[PDB]
Scaffold this motif. Structure first.
Motif, PDB file in Angstrom:
ATOM      1  N   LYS A  82      96.123  60.545 -13.330  1.00 42.35           N
ATOM      2  CA  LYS A  82      96.817  61.543 -12.525  1.00 42.35           C
ATOM      3  C   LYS A  82      97.266  62.699 -13.411  1.00 42.35           C
ATOM      4  O   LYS A  82      98.120  62.526 -14.288  1.00 42.35           O
ATOM      5  CB  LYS A  82      98.013  60.908 -11.818  1.00 42.35           C
ATOM      6  CG  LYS A  82      98.741  61.824 -10.835  1.00 42.35           C
ATOM      7  CD  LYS A  82      97.892  62.143  -9.614  1.00 42.35           C
ATOM      8  CE  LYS A  82      98.658  62.995  -8.616  1.00 42.35           C
ATOM      9  NZ  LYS A  82      97.873  63.253  -7.377  1.00 42.35           N
ATOM     10  N   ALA A  83      96.692  63.876 -13.182  1.00 43.73           N
ATOM     11  CA  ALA A  83      97.063  65.054 -13.953  1.00 43.73           C
ATOM     12  C   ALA A  83      98.502  65.455 -13.652  1.00 43.73           C
ATOM     13  O   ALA A  83      98.967  65.357 -12.513  1.00 43.73           O
ATOM     14  CB  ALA A  83      96.117  66.212 -13.642  1.00 43.73           C
ATOM     15  N   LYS A  84      99.207  65.909 -14.688  1.00 42.45           N
ATOM     16  CA  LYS A  84     100.598  66.329 -14.581  1.00 42.45           C
ATOM     17  C   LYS A  84     100.729  67.769 -15.051  1.00 42.45           C
ATOM     18  O   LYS A  84     100.162  68.142 -16.083  1.00 42.45           O
ATOM     19  CB  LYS A  84     101.515  65.422 -15.408  1.00 42.45           C
ATOM     20  CG  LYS A  84     101.600  63.993 -14.894  1.00 42.45           C
ATOM     21  CD  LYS A  84     102.486  63.121 -15.776  1.00 42.45           C
ATOM     22  CE  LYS A  84     103.954  63.512 -15.678  1.00 42.45           C
ATOM     23  NZ  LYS A  84     104.833  62.574 -16.428  1.00 42.45           N
ATOM     24  N   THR A  85     101.473  68.570 -14.293  1.00 40.83           N
ATOM     25  CA  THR A  85     101.720  69.950 -14.685  1.00 40.83           C
ATOM     26  C   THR A  85     102.503  69.991 -15.991  1.00 40.83           C
ATOM     27  O   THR A  85     103.421  69.195 -16.208  1.00 40.83           O
ATOM     28  CB  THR A  85     102.490  70.691 -13.591  1.00 40.83           C
ATOM     29  OG1 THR A  85     103.731  70.020 -13.339  1.00 40.83           O
ATOM     30  CG2 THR A  85     101.673  70.752 -12.308  1.00 40.83           C
ATOM     31  N   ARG A  86     102.132  70.926 -16.868  1.00 43.64           N
ATOM     32  CA  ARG A  86     102.886  71.101 -18.103  1.00 43.64           C
ATOM     33  C   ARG A  86     104.334  71.476 -17.819  1.00 43.64           C
ATOM     34  O   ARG A  86     105.226  71.153 -18.612  1.00 43.64           O
ATOM     35  CB  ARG A  86     102.223  72.161 -18.984  1.00 43.64           C
ATOM     36  CG  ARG A  86     101.027  71.637 -19.762  1.00 43.64           C
ATOM     37  CD  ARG A  86     100.473  72.676 -20.720  1.00 43.64           C
ATOM     38  NE  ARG A  86      99.725  73.717 -20.027  1.00 43.64           N
ATOM     39  CZ  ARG A  86      99.141  74.748 -20.623  1.00 43.64           C
ATOM     40  NH1 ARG A  86      99.214  74.926 -21.933  1.00 43.64           N
ATOM     41  NH2 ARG A  86      98.462  75.623 -19.886  1.00 43.64           N
ATOM     42  N   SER A  87     104.589  72.152 -16.697  1.00 45.11           N
ATOM     43  CA  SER A  87     105.964  72.415 -16.288  1.00 45.11           C
ATOM     44  C   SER A  87     106.714  71.111 -16.042  1.00 45.11           C
ATOM     45  O   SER A  87     107.871  70.959 -16.447  1.00 45.11           O
ATOM     46  CB  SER A  87     105.976  73.290 -15.036  1.00 45.11           C
ATOM     47  OG  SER A  87     105.388  74.552 -15.293  1.00 45.11           O
TER      48      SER A  87
END
Lengths: 97, 95, 102, 83, 109, 97, 83, 121, 95, 102
Positions: free
Chosen positions: E4-9
């Motif tokens: 699951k990709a996660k936003t760098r924010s």
DNA sequence: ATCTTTCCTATTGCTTTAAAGGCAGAGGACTGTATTGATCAGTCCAAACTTCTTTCTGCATGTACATGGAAAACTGGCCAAGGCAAACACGTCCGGAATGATGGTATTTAAGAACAAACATTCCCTGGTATCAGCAAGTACAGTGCCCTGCTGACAGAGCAGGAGACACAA
DNA sequence: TTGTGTCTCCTGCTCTGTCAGCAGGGCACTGTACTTGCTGATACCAGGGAATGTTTGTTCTTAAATACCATCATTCCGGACGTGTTTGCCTTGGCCAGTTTTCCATGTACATGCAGAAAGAAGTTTGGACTGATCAATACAGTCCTCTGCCTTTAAAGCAATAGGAAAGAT
């Protein structure tokens, strides 16, 4: 009786001289000491190049000359030939300083 | 539909909800805030690029951003921003 | 010597008339008066200020400036033509019907 | 080593000369204190940026180029120092 | 399989877009290269300043009995705060007006 | 007897009113016409967005408000409560224009 | 089509209102002409840069962003339209 | 192939004195844009040369007014400030070891009185 | 070894000889001239970069330089500078 | 150490005289001066330029080129035969009526 | 000091339009792997900064006399504040259009990438003439004692007409 | 012989001559300081030789930019009408300017003291250069979901009207 120039003559002659000349008006070593003292607060045991101090002195002298010109203009606007702290304050406020 | 035009409205709105959940904001105020964000971004980026050029470096790191923030922001606003940036970078570094 | 039996008006009139150019400055008037009257060699300031007042007051005397800077430092003084022979023939000490311009 | 009272180094005749170059004919006595205060504020403002520039370079010697950048950063562009 | 990709924010815990800031920095010709921590730091600073200004504007709006922030409230918040006013001294705010200020000498006796 | 406010009261009232308000003070249409008149000198048949005209009006109004504030400060400096053209000239000169 | 004398469009009441917003209590008669001249000079200065920016893009319409850039170049940055 | 033709500097080809190649290198290294046009360095060098020529001409005129032959910062300051357009271009610029234009307000000048006796209150 | 110190002193000197063959220039004057050249170069380059960014141009052409010169230089300086630049570019293109 | 009781002219004259070829370059002159006077070890950028000024201003020193390309950089310097006795008889510091060609 | 008049401020209802919420989608942001050269780490030069000492003035401080510029006070008049009435021109909507800013695709030509050649630009000697420092003259202007030209109020004393005495005419 | 007109001498108001004294305007002479000439010293502008690295030349290539055409959006212009704002006038009052007066604080001059500037030297810190390395960014490919746009919804704020209270002005 000995000669005594009326007030105004010496001031105008000094104005003419210092406007015609270009040499620095602030003594170098006390200015360097003040610069070092101011720098002590920001950081301790700093080193400074001589050219940097000369540039600082040049910039400060130019800024003060401009401020005094504005002060003289403000004082003349008030039908006065004597600059006062109110003149400097007004000049700084107008210039946003 | 027309070409997409990106803006920072959602982020400012989220921050507004965080600080003041009850209040709202107007569209003109939203545009003003977006202009402010763009201006600050441009100032900081320009200062960082100038610092990199003075240092003859090719990359801009968080150190350059911190230097620009300290140079731009006055007084207490600068140090609080520096602390926030340090906290954010520390959190991101842990991945 | 006592005071000459002549008014200062008469003295100025005589000094002006005897001048080759019919005009004299204050210094020339003083020089002529002192030369021709040993009485006025003393008490200079009093009668000199009196002459100043007489010149500034009497209309029969009219000043003429010196245009090309001349020796300078002093304007010529001339008799008004309409004055005529007012002090002539035995009325030096008191003229009759002094001259008025208007 | 510690410096404490260099602000008095800005002498009354020096301020007089600076005002004279600005064309000031007559100077009030209270000008000098205000002049010193304004000069100190300006010096602090410039030197803070200069020190920031020096620290970001990781150097301990303040160079004239840092002063030029700080002055230019405040709109006071200066020549004659390699800028 | 890809996780699951996660936003760098989200990774930095910030609301502002780290990716957008990084893309703007790369596309802005500011430097040949851009660091990873630089956009995070810049986004954090921007978020902090935005939060401060929004908080002051909301306080001003509550003073004016309003609930939606308007340019007048923004101007009031900016100029009443010394630091923000100095930061935005040269900036002009549309529909912002000016603070209420009347000189003492002009007041009647 | 008819009621009449003494001089200065209405001035202070109007100052309070327009300092509290935010709407534009210059009439939109004549200002737009003036902008077009100035614009045509550089190029003919120039189009203009309405938002551009509004932004120009906002900038001009802000600049004039600042100039008037500086003028009032200068007038108060000379112990005067009435602005005069010399006040605006001094303000412009000190501002650097 | 052509415009002749719209500088008179800045009416005396408008100038009075502008001065009042600046806290001016009393206004001299000669202010109105000087204010008109200063406003005309400022408008010309801004519009020259705006038209230059418009020309560079090869557009015949002066957009809001052109005005923002022109004002920003003169150190008079304006928000609320940069979008 | 084709045998390399003898090289001629782009400055020589354009007739300018300033270095076209150095300007192009500076533009490319300055990160101003992803690419630099070929004519852009030429145009920029020409404009810089024209500005330098104008300033140097005015400074030399000022030096001749001062009976000097080598330009010094005072001459540059006088040339820049006396000229209106250059002064506007460089209004906020400061020159090291410079001065100011001789200027005294008329009010500050001594009061010319027809009657002039010894000073009294 | 010490780093090379490149500058524009020779070119400024050649221009000075072109306009005033007799007069000289001092070392500090040469440095001030170099600083002025650097400042003008930076201003024009930044203006051109901003113009290209507004127009999304990936390259800076002579037209962008002309626009920057028009925007920056006031009055007659802009016109004469534009004429000189156009003449130089035309001469370069002809050969 | 203080400055020697010899002017740059006298020092250069002695350096040229002691040369086997009666000619030297600036590098050799500097080497000789530094070796024979410890005072000139310091302030090199000052006194080397002073020696340059002496050799260049004074017409009594006349230059000679290098024919077979020698080490290359630096043309030779020679005393003018018409100089004669200038620093002789106790006038090392100053030369009365400095030599002029024109 | 208390009453009249005016204005600002606030309260309540309607509405409207401006901001909040739902859903589609897409293109730009996240994940994963390899290259790399831009950056970091360690060692040395030297040169440039910092530190200390001795002398000589040029500068700054201290003191005293004094004048004119700052400050205050009063008068007035004329400039501008305050209010009324009329006219119009700004402001609003309603629609036409037409002008032009922006989207889509082709292509072309312009510049980026790579390597060889080189010569233009830089560093180290070299002659000589333009600029800085010290002492001495001529030029320039400031300041002021003194004098000429104006005016003003009042006192002192000769002029010449008026009145009285002396003398001669008239009745 | 007696009364009165006319000539002559004394008297007395008139009017001019003289005095004291303050105001403007102007000149000559002394004194002080600025600028220039001469001399000396010096430093930097320009010719000569060696080096290196940056620019030109040539080719390939690929994509940025220009051109052509299409599309709709958004700004210019006109028409009608509402009525709020501006222009013109009138009154008058109080703020700016002029004039006068007061006095004190800045200017000017001189006397004394002192530390800034500069030469010289020593001590010392690290800015930058060089080599090894190592790791964080860029490049490229896949994919997936965050932000923008459209449409719908509802409530915060603006408009309209009324009413309460503050405060200015006046006798």
């Amino acid at each position: 009786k000995p000669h005594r120039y009326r007030p105004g003559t010496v001031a105008l002659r000094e104005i003419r001289r210092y406007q015609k000349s270009t040499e620095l008006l602030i003594r170098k070593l006390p200015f360097q000491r003040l610069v070092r003292e101011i720098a002590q607060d920001f950081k301790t045991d700093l080193r400074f190049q001589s050219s940097a101090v000369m540039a600082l002195q040049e910039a400060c002298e130019a800024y003060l000359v401009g401020l005094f010109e504005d002060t003289n203009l403000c004082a003349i606007h008030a039908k006065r030939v004597t600059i006062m702290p109110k003149d400097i304050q007004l000049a700084r406020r107008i210039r946003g300083e | 539909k027309r070409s997409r035009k990106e803006s920072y409205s959602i982020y400012v709105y989220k921050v507004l909800k965080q600080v003041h959940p009850d209040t709202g904001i107007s569209s003109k105020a939203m545009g003003i805030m977006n202009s402010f964000v763009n201006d600050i971004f441009e100032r900081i980026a320009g200062e960082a690029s100038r610092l990199a050029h003075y240092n003859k470096r090719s990359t801009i790191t968080s150190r350059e951003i911190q230097t620009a923030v300290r140079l731009l922001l006055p007084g207490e606003l600068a140090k609080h921003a520096v602390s926030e940036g340090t906290k954010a970078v520390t959190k991101y570094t842990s991945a | 010597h006592a005071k000459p039996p002549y008014s200062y008006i008469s003295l100025i009139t005589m000094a002006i008339q005897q001048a080759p150019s019919k005009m004299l400055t204050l210094s020339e008037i003083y020089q002529w008066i002192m030369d021709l009257f040993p009485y006025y060699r003393q008490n200079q300031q009093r009668w000199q200020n009196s002459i100043r007042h007489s010149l500034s007051f009497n209309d029969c005397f009219v000043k003429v400036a010196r245009s090309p800077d001349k020796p300078g430092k002093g304007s010529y003084w001339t008799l008004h033509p309409d004055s005529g022979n007012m002090f002539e023939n035995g009325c030096y000490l008191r003229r009759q019907k002094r001259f008025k311009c208007e | 080593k510690v410096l404490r009272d260099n602000i008095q180094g800005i002498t009354k005749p020096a301020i007089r000369r600076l005002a004279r170059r600005g064309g000031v004919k007559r100077i009030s006595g209270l000008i000098y204190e205000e002049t010193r205060g304004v000069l100190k504020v300006f010096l602090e403002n410039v030197i803070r940026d200069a020190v920031t520039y020096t620290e970001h370079a990781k150097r301990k010697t303040v160079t004239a180029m840092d002063v030029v950048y700080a002055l230019k950063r405040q709109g006071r562009t200066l020549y004659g120092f390699g800028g | 399989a890809r996780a699951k990709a996660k936003t760098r924010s989200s990774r930095a815990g910030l609301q502002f877009p780290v990716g957008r800031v990084h893309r703007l920095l790369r596309k802005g010709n500011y430097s040949e290269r851009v660091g990873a921590g630089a956009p995070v730091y810049l986004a954090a600073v921007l978020e902090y300043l935005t939060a401060e200004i929004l908080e002051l504007a909301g306080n001003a709006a509550r003073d004016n009995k309003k609930t939606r922030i308007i340019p007048r409230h923004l101007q009031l918040a900016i100029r009443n705060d010394e630091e923000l006013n100095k930061l935005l001294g040269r900036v002009t705010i549309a529909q912002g007006g000016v603070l209420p200020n009347i000189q003492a000498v002009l007041l009647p006796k």
